[PDB]
Amino acid sequence: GGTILVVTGTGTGVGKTVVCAALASAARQAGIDVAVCKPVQTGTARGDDDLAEVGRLAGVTQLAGLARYPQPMAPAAAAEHAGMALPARDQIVRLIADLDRPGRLTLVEGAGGLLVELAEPGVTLRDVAVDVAAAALVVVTADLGTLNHTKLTLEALAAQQVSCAGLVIGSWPDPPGLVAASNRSALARIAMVRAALPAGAASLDAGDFAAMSAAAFDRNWVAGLV
Amino acid sequence: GGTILVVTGTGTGVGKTVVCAALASAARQAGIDVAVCKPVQTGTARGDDDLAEVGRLAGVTQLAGLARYPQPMAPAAAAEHAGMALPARDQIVRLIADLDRPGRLTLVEGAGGLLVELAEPGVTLRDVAVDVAAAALVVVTADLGTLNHTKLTLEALAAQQVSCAGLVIGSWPDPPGLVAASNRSALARIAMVRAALPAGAASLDAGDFAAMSAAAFDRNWVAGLVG
Ligand SMILES: Nc1ncnc2c1ncn2[C@@H]1O[C@H](COP(=O)(O)OP(=O)(O)OP(=O)(O)O)[C@@H](O)[C@H]1O
Ligand SMILES: Nc1ncnc2c1ncn2[C@@H]1O[C@H](COP(=O)(O)OP(=O)(O)OP(=O)(O)O)[C@@H](O)[C@H]1O
Ligand SMILES: [Mg+2]
Ligand SMILES: [Mg+2]
Numbered sequence: 001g002g003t004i005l006v007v008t009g010t011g012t013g014v015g016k017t018v019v020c021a022a023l024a025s026a027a028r029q030a031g032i033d034v035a036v037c038k039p040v041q042t043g044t045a046r047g048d049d050d051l052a053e054v055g056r057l058a059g060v061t062q063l064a065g066l067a068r069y070p071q072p073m074a075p076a077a078a079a080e081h082a083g084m085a086l087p088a089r090d091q092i093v094r095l096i097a098d099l100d101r102p103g104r105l106t107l108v109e110g111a112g113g114l115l116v117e118l119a120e121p122g123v124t125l126r127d128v129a130v131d132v133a134a135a136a137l138v139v140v141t142a143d144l145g146t147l148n149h150t151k152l153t154l155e156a157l158a159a160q161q162v163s164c165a166g167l168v169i170g171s172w173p174d175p176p177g178l179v180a181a182s183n184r185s186a187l188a189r190i191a192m193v194r195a196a197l198p199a200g201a202a203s204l205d206a207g208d209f210a211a212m213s214a215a216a217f218d219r220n221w222v223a224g225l226v
Numbered sequence: 227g228g229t230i231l232v233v234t235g236t237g238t239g240v241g242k243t244v245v246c247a248a249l250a251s252a253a254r255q256a257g258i259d260v261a262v263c264k265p266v267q268t269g270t271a272r273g274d275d276d277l278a279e280v281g282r283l284a285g286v287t288q289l290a291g292l293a294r295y296p297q298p299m300a301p302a303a304a305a306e307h308a309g310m311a312l313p314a315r316d317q318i319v320r321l322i323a324d325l326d327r328p329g330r331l332t333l334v335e336g337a338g339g340l341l342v343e344l345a346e347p348g349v350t351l352r353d354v355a356v357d358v359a360a361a362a363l364v365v366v367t368a369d370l371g372t373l374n375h376t377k378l379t380l381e382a383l384a385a386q387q388v389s390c391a392g393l394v395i396g397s398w399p400d401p402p403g404l405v406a407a408s409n410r411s412a413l414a415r416i417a418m419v420r421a422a423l424p425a426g427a428a429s430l431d432a433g434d435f436a437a438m439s440a441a442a443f444d445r446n447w448v449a450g451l452v453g
Contacts, residue, residue: 071405073408077373114374115373115378115381148339152341155378182303
């Protein structure tokens with residue numbers, strides 16, 4: 001056994017891909033084996049491909065997924081439109097357990113939010129964390145409203161004994177602003193803020209990105225993921 | 227007393243005020259005496275004033291505030307920035323209890339989402355609904371990301387045994403996109419969708435807003451809120 005984390009987001013478009021990328025790239029630069037799994041990818045019509053973005057930005061080659069739906073909806077909504085069931089709960093859990101091995105950091109990127117249907121029937125990213133005993137990394141904004149959403153997600157995590165590996169602000173703006181600045185200290189007061197990626201990091205080339213990612217996360221913390 | 231409903235949102239800016247004004251208007255039309263209560267108001271130096279807008283739109287006069295903070299920030303931070311404290315619990319709860327009276331529908335509008343801090347320490351709108359025995363009407367969007375936001379909110383409500391009075395889509399676009407329609411349909415499977423206010427309802431005048439309101443809601447449901 002190794003270390004699986006689910007990476008989940010408080011909202012639409014908070015930067016969870018760039019955070020998996022970032023944490024993958026920081027953890028690869030610590031000589032850890034890293035695999036990112038995206039069981040369900042939606043929004044392929046407009047061209048989403050989060051595993052690819054983790055490949056380009058972070059250089060991970062163990063990139064595992066199971067289904068791809070064109071529509072930019074929540075998984076079940078993009079499958080109900082498509083006419084094709086979500087993966088079975090069994091496929092998601094065994095894909096992740098097969099990736100997982102001693103010494104490997106395994107990131108598991110949700111589709112949408114923590115409590116949306118990820119596999120048939122009605123089984124969510126939170127269930128999947130329970131089934132594989134993964135902790136949850138929560139991606140958050142700094143913008144107004146983040147506090148409510150973040151408390152809501154930690155409550156939903158604790159309610160099923162899914163540990164919270166911490167928060168990551170997916171976009172730290174420049175210059176902050178009073179709200180961004182206030183929310184960041186407040187978020188640090190209810191959970192540990194593992195990192196706050198600079199805005200626009202999702203366009204750095206592979207090398208610039210890797211230096212940012214190495215600067216974003218705590219050295220010992222990454223290493224301690226093991 | 228009467229019937230107290232807190233009206234909380236899944237997010238910032240989903241339409242809590244318009245929904246409070248619309249349900250008040252529909253309830254006033256049914257012959258139900260209505261009070262609208264905004265215990266904690268932020269953004270007053272931006273002109274924010276949810277109680278005023280509720281009068282502007284639904285002609286309610288039994289309005290009741292308590293705390294007002296200049297900054298458009300969360301109540302805790304707007305207070306700090308203004309060298310002020312948040313109100314106390316029983317200051318907020320006394321405000322609502324005073325309003326509660328048999329035959330009256332008392333609407334309590336939160337400040338942001340359900341778990342935003344309203345009073346010190348960590349006192350939320352949910353803790354307040356528990357104390358005044360209130361149910362929660364939840365205002366949502368149809369944009370993607372709503373199902374998670376609505377599921378997180380219902381879970382938080384159930385965790386303290388606060389009954390969900392239903393959902394209200396605060397803004398609903400005509401015509402509706404494929405994401406919107408799909409989300410609405412799925413929202414209805416999570417809970418009862420009491421209403422879906424047409425986009426731009428806040429710009430309506432007294433007359434149109436009242437008619438929009440009477441047709442936005444099921445008259446039998448609105449009737450049944452107050453025994
Ligand atoms: N005002 C805005 N400024 C910047 N980006 C915006 C804005 N409005 C919408 N977006 C979009 O939000 C998206 C950023 O979210 P991102 O793709 O990082 O989501 P995620 O949570 O990491 O992953 P996924 O969506 O794949 O689950 C971008 O496509 C961006 O263009
Ligand atoms: N420049 C702005 N001025 C006023 N409101 C703004 C502005 N920018 C964004 N908003 C948001 O749009 C929301 C829409 O008003 P409305 O009151 O109907 O929504 P709400 O869900 O009730 O939010 P609130 O609890 O803050 O009143 C405002 O609450 C506010 O959060
Ligand atoms: Mg992704
Ligand atoms: Mg309001």
